[PDB]
Design a binder for this molecule. Structure first.
Ligand SMILES: O=C(N[C@H](CO)[C@H](O)c1ccc([N+](=O)[O-])cc1)C(Cl)Cl
Ligand SMILES: O=C(N[C@H](CO)[C@H](O)c1ccc([N+](=O)[O-])cc1)C(Cl)Cl
Ligand SMILES: O=C(N[C@H](CO)[C@H](O)c1ccc([N+](=O)[O-])cc1)C(Cl)Cl
Lengths: 139, 139, 139
């Protein structure tokens, strides 16, 4: 049960707004709180492993993004949570262990990890939410 | 007189330099202090509102970017100001209220907000200057 | 012996990993620690000077990136160093002076500055390393 950081970082960002939504500057991922329905896709996270034929690929969430076996995006001020489910788009088997989401089998896996809203959270306060995931391997 | 944050953030950045100017890395917006003449354009800010047929679109500047009914870009160290005027490129009417720049009429407005140097400031200390504007609505 | 900041900033980033390397999200510069051999290229830094016909172009490294006439990328936590050599790809002559790398002759130089691993450092701890260089002129 140990994660070894070894890889790069993917940052999933979402700006939550009200129905009257004012987009300023370049396009970013934004949704009204009413769109935060159960299983709503937030976005994909690409994963490409190399040199892991004998290790279990893994992603570790920043400390501020997990608690009690649950993952969540966190607001800029660290106060507000948006609970999510993390799931590879393929049929591969993974396990969650204290902020770590690791593959059950060894191998240099490449694939897409989807981030989805876990439970309708249409009362989420408007703000900027982030989930940070770092590549590495588990054992 | 209340701003409700609801939208994304646009960041206007400018690096001020001397006449001998050394650009390192990728292109960014940079000017010599001698170019900071009155009404000099710093750059455009896009605004695209959705679902605001019954609200007044608004942009709020970060606390560090306004004081006394005046807006300004602020240096990285929070010390130096570059006073600017904020004005939509179209003929629409807006109002300034304590760091908030709001549209006089309701509607899902889309347009360009220009950022211009307010008063010649050719003695501005070289540094990195930023103005941050967040989308939302006023009332 | 004085650097005057006047120009923009170039940030050289490198993520060091183990042999089992898990890339998450968009492509960034990453190497296994085994690739950190002597003279290994980390990446180029573009420099384009304007209005410097009578000044010596210069780049100053952030305080956290130099000590004792040596430059280094520094880990996110400020603890770990990756010593590098900084060298223009052309035949021009430069001098190092306390975190400052300046050109020996005046002129509005444009060119590429290469960043190379200085001494094999294959035991470098996995992490994110950065070197920040700001444009200006020396005298
Ligand atoms: O954002 C996602 N999906 C969309 C549907 O809204 C779509 O299925 C999709 C799948 C893959 C993809 N990719 O691989 O880049 C992008 C979008 C899920 Cl992976 Cl969270
Ligand atoms: O940067 C601006 N303007 C330039 C002139 O220097 C030009 O008028 C312009 C107008 C619109 C624009 N846009 O819509 O992206 C970009 C440049 C002003 Cl909007 Cl501040
Ligand atoms: O990254 C570098 N070099 C590569 C070799 O790995 C190559 O020589 C190169 C040279 C110039 C260049 N550029 O000008 O953008 C990019 C790569 C050195 Cl400049 Cl550090």
């Amino acid at each position: 049960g140990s994660f070894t950081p070894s890889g790069t970082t993917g940052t999933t960002k979402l700006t939550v707004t009200e129905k009257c939504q004012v987009r300023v500057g370049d396009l970013t991922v934004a949704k009204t709180r009413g769109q935060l329905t159960d299983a709503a896709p937030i976005g994909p996270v690409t994963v490409q492993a190399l040199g892991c034929d004998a290790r279990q690929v893994a992603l570790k969430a920043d400390t501020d993004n997990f608690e009690q076996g649950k993952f969540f995006l966190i607001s800029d001020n660290n106060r507000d949570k948006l609970y999510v489910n993390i799931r590879p788009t393929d049929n591969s088997a993974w396990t969650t262990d204290n902020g770590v989401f690791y593959k059950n089998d060894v191998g240099s896996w490449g694939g897409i990890i989807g981030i989805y809203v876990d439970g309708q959270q249409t009362n989420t306060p408007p703000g900027n939410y982030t989930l940070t995931l770092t590549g590495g391997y588990w054992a």
